Amino acid sequence: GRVIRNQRKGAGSIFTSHTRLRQGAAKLRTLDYAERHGYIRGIVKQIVHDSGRGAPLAKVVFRDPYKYRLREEIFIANEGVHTGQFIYAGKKASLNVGNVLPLGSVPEGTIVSNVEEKPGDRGALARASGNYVIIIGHNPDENKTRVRLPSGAKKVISSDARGVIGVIAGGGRVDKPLLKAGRAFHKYRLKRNSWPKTRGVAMNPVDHPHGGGNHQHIGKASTISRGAVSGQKAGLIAARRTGLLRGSQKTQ
Amino acid sequence: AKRTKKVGITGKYGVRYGSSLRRQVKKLEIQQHARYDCSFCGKKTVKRGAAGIWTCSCCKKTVAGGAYTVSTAAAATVRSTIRRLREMVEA
Amino acid sequence: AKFLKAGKVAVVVRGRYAGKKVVIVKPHDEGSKSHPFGHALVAGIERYPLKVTKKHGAKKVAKRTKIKPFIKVVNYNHLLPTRYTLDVEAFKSVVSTETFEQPSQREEAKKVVKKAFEERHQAGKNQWFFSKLRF
Amino acid sequence: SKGNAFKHKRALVEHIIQAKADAQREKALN
Amino acid sequence: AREITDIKQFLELTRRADVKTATVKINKKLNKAGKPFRQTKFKVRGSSSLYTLVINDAGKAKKLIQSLPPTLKVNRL
Amino acid sequence: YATVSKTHKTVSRAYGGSRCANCVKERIIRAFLIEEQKIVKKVVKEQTEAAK
Amino acid sequence: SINQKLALVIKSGKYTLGYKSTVKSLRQGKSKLIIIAANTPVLRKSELEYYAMLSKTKVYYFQGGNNELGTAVGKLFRVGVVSILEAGDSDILTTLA
RNA sequence: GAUGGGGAAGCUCCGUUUCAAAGGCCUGAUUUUAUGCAGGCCACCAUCGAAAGGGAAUCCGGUUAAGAUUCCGGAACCUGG
RNA sequence: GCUUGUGACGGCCCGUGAAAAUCCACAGGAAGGAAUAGUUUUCAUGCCAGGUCGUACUGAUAACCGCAGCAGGUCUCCAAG
RNA sequence: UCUAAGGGUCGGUACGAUCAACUUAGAACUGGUACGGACAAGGGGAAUCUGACUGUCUAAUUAAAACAUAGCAUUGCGAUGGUCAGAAAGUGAUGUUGACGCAAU
RNA sequence: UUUACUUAUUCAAUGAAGCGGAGCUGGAAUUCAUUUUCCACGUUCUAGCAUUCAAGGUCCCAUUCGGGGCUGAUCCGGGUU
Numbered sequence A: 001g002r003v004i005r006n007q008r009k010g011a012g013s014i015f016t017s018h019t020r021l022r023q024g025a026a027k028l029r030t031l032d033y034a035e036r037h038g039y040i041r042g043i044v045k046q047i048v049h050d051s052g053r054g055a056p057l058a059k060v061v062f063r064d065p066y067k068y069r070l071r072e073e074i075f076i077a078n079e080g081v082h083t084g085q086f087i088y089a090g091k092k093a094s095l096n097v098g099n100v101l102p103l104g105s106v107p108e109g110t111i112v113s114n115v116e117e118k119p120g121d122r123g124a125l126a127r128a129s130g131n132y133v134i135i136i137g138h139n140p141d142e143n144k145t146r147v148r149l150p151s152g153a154k155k156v157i158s159s160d161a162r163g164v165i166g167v168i169a170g171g172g173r174v175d176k177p178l179l180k181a182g183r184a185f186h187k188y189r190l191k192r193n194s195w196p197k198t199r200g201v202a203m204n205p206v207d208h209p210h211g212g213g214n215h216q217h218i219g220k221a222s223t224i225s226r227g228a229v230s231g232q233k234a235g236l237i238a239a240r241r242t243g244l245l246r247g248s249q250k251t252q
Numbered sequence B: 001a002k003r004t005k006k007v008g009i010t011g012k013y014g015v016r017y018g019s020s021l022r023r024q025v026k027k028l029e030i031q032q033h034a035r036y037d038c039s040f041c042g043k044k045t046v047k048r049g050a051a052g053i054w055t056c057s058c059c060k061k062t063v064a065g066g067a068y069t070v071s072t073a074a075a076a077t078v079r080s081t082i083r084r085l086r087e088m089v090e091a
Numbered sequence C: 001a002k003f004l005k006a007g008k009v010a011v012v013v014r015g016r017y018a019g020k021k022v023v024i025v026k027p028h029d030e031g032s033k034s035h036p037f038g039h040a041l042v043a044g045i046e047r048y049p050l051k052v053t054k055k056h057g058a059k060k061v062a063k064r065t066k067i068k069p070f071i072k073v074v075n076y077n078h079l080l081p082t083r084y085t086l087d088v089e090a091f092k093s094v095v096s097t098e099t100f101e102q103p104s105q106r107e108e109a110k111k112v113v114k115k116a117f118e119e120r121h122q123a124g125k126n127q128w129f130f131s132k133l134r135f
Numbered sequence D: 001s002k003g004n005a006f007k008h009k010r011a012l013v014e015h016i017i018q019a020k021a022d023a024q025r026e027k028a029l030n
Numbered sequence E: 001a002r003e004i005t006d007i008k009q010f011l012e013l014t015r016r017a018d019v020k021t022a023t024v025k026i027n028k029k030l031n032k033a034g035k036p037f038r039q040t041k042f043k044v045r046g047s048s049s050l051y052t053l054v055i056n057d058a059g060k061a062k063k064l065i066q067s068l069p070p071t072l073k074v075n076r077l
Numbered sequence F: 001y002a003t004v005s006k007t008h009k010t011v012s013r014a015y016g017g018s019r020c021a022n023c024v025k026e027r028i029i030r031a032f033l034i035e036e037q038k039i040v041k042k043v044v045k046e047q048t049e050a051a052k
Numbered sequence G: 001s002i003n004q005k006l007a008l009v010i011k012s013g014k015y016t017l018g019y020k021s022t023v024k025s026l027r028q029g030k031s032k033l034i035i036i037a038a039n040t041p042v043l044r045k046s047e048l049e050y051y052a053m054l055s056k057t058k059v060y061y062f063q064g065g066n067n068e069l070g071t072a073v074g075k076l077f078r079v080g081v082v083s084i085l086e087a088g089d090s091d092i093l094t095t096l097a
Numbered sequence H: 001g002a003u004g005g006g007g008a009a010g011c012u013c014c015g016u017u018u019c020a021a022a023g024g025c026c027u028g029a030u031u032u033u034a035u036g037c038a039g040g041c042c043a044c045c046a047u048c049g050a051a052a053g054g055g056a057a058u059c060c061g062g063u064u065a066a067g068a069u070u071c072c073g074g075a076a077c078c079u080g081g
Numbered sequence I: 001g002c003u004u005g006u007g008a009c010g011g012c013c014c015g016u017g018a019a020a021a022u023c024c025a026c027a028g029g030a031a032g033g034a035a036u037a038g039u040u041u042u043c044a045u046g047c048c049a050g051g052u053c054g055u056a057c058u059g060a061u062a063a064c065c066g067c068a069g070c071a072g073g074u075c076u077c078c079a080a081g
Numbered sequence J: 001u002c003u004a005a006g007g008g009u010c011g012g013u014a015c016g017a018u019c020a021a022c023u024u025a026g027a028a029c030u031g032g033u034a035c036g037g038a039c040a041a042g043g044g045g046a047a048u049c050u051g052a053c054u055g056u057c058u059a060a061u062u063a064a065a066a067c068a069u070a071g072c073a074u075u076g077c078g079a080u081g082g083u084c085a086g087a088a089a090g091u092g093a094u095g096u097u098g099a100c101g102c103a104a105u
Numbered sequence K: 001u002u003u004a005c006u007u008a009u010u011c012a013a014u015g016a017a018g019c020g021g022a023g024c025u026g027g028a029a030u031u032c033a034u035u036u037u038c039c040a041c042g043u044u045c046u047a048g049c050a051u052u053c054a055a056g057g058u059c060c061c062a063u064u065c066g067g068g069g070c071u072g073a074u075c076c077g078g079g080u081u
């Protein structure tokens, strides 16, 4: 047969990310002596839009503690954050929207975003528009914070990991229909080459396992095992359930 | 004189895309094109550009909000519970 | 009440002297043909004395502490009054409405204000007035 | 005059004279 | 490419120790509302630019040529 | 700008050819008021602990 | 409350509206009490406090934005600061404000 | 696409600020002589990549069998010193 | 009126629509400096120099690619009544 | 061949003058009843099957009901990860990404 | 089968900047001979400002124009975290 479409994405030739107009990597301030022993004040100079990102960015400038210069950071804007607002980042910062605090020094039920997985990686969770995590309980001895991830999974991470108070701005974006392929064309025009998508059932047997036949049908079970091979993982991979669920979701 | 009965702003789409899809877009396009009050200067000059960014016409204050509304109802109750937990620290 | 008098120190916020501290000498509360607005005659600091330490000795101490004054009529809306004060009767008469209008008497007026500001920078008098405003 | 209210220049002058007549004739009775 | 208005400073241009040539241009122009007059142009060729003097009075023209230094190559017309 | 003289590129003021003469007035009032409040901030604190 | 005390000074006393004229009245020392809206910018709010401190003028902080401060003084426009020069039948200058 | 490195029997591959001891800049001291040594700085860390992107500065008249915003005449401007 | 430049605005986006070399300004006050005379080449004027390669012509129903002096194909500017 | 209406500039409780636009409407008269006179320039209606539509492809026999599409739904994955690439690698794509996301249908 | 460990190995960060231990100062805190214990230990109305091996204090040079220690800024260990 022929190398199928999902196998060619790993080569990275035309499937790379379109990064010309992006404003830079959105990261928290580097964890230094000031943040783990006090706080540092930053000024939101301007809120700018990032190409290919649903959420807006915030350019916060800090003073370098060891050299006389200005250090401009690229934060992800939370709702309520405005230009000129003072942003306090550190262990002793107050509990206000836009501030950056370690999760060990926030109360239970706090809503935070741009959360570090490991302390010092500068933000890994609750990062897309309209997303947040909930601080469900603490653990002083064997210091770990239990959080509620946006997918609903419960995770245990260190209490020294930092996070931005509030919810990521730009929520409710996916609540509006695009109404046409043209608006969907410009959306993927700035992210990567993954649109439009041809169905594998309408392909040839060389191009997809679902291709071929006198009728457009898959032919075999679309549930693909986890231990399968590249070129076989087409369709539902390691699916523990299929079909439309009768009932509700959001497990308590 | 009122020119359309129910399509309103979505009259530019003609007869395409269905009535129900056009109806929910109408609710969000009205929100994203309307003006809002500036909490800092008190003027009705807040307008949307580059969704998630809300700029006051005068007053140069730019506030990060929702995609189609200046304040998301989810963020409204978050701003309250973040506020509520804050009085338990000092008092 | 009336707090714009001959004693109070004011800060100019508009025009070639913004951010520089002045002292009001002759406040004209209301009315003048050449100035239809409330104004006051002030004397200020154009070039503040430089930071001097004990390592500098006897030749540049007299150089780093050279004060260049100026006299100017300033609108009340262009002044930022302070709660500080500065003794003014030392040079109250050398500056007036007639020191302008044939400016040849301005340089004679500035010399008296200069030497009065030199001797009050001496002996630690009004140390806030001779400190340059950083902005 | 922004909506229409006046089909040309002459209709506006006539409406000015008539409205000024309606302004001074009510002053005589006050 | 530069016009000169004052007569006294124009003589200093002719003795700048770098100018060597000068031209006198005679033009026939009409008055604002009357008879035509004799307008003359005195042009000094400097090292970097050309200085011109437009004299609209014929009486000033004849006594200004007398004031030109003899060490200048004056080109009539 | 390198060819033209100095007076065409600046005005006779602090932050002359850099700011619009209105943000200059704002940042002088702000400089004076914050520093004035800063020394009021310390005279309040000076006897706050001493009067415990 | 404060609102009906503000209604008396409009029709029985002399007052001043706006920022520029409030400072002019406060430099002249003709103001007895200034009222500042809640949404007034802090840089302007802190300047009025410093100006009133120099003239020994009481400062009252209105519990509302400039949109309703003008409503209190009976004006359809928004007023950021209200200056009281001479009170009439009101007792605002003798109340806790 | 080199270097430092890491792969590969090897032709060579990965990688581009990368697990590196990765440099020259204003000078001032010298009056033996040429540029030793004295402080302070700056850490960007090869290079290639557009005759339609970015970009220091020229115009008019005349002229050849065939050349010119390039030659001639006149009048300018920029850069470096 | 046509072509074009430009200004102030308005509409559109789950699309908000390059980078760098380079030049300037400001903050800063290091250093350097006058009165029997010293300090300016971002003011005016004066002096010198500006190298290397390309530059003709066609650009198409005959100069390009199609076996060719082929009704095919091949980017763009100027636009009278 | 005429008529009416639509403007500009100097003097504006005695408003007449003067210069400059093709626009529309109306009325007679006239002809071998012709007149968007050449040029230019929609056939229309009543239904069925089918795909929603704009769009896309078999360059050189198939332009379609085929593909794409918005919408809808399912699945995998919280980074010591999901999917994929590489002979190997202190190697890479998504990823200047983080579940309103990416990946597979 | 669990658990513990300095380092081997692995992952991440940072122009390897403040780690670990002890000691000061205060207080919460309670004394049953005295501290048998625990946290703090310069910045939160405001789109200003923060750099010249730091001013000050104190001690040296050979007074001359300036140069150098301690402190300001606790000490100890070189395990970058």
Ligand SMILES: [Zn+2]
Residues within 6 Å of the ligand: B038, B039, B040, B041, B042, B043, B045, B056, B058, B059, B060, B061
């Ligand atoms: Zn506003």
